[PDB]
């Protein structure tokens, strides 16, 4: 199971980080890690396992 509404406003919990927003598919290899966070501390994007 991995429910993931794509293009609407939603709540979310990703790897113990919570919030609200909308999810966009991107094209970037970035195989270095699993989570990307901004300088402010708000996550910007994540990669599926």
């Amino acid at each position: 199971f991995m429910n993931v509404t794509l293009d609407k406003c939603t709540k979310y919990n990703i790897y113990d980080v919570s919030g609200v927003g909308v999810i966009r598919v991107s094209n970037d290899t970035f195989l270095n890690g699993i989570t990307y966070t901004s300088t402010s501390g708000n996550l910007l994007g994540f990669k599926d396992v």
Partner: protein, 48 residues
């Protein structure tokens, strides 16, 4: 690690309590099997 931390591609999935010894059961028919399995220690460095 000796502490038992387990890291795949940088992130750490889980940490085992302790490891006395490690044995790697990897079998490759290819003669040019792999590049390296090494030991190492902590240090303080900078990176770009």
């Amino acid at each position: 690690s000796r502490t038992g931390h387990f890291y795949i591609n940088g992130y750490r999935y889980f940490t085992l309590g302790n490891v006395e010894a490690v044995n790697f059961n990897v079998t490759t028919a290819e003669t040019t099997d792999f590049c390296t399995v090494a030991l190492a220690s902590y240090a303080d460095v900078l990176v770009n």
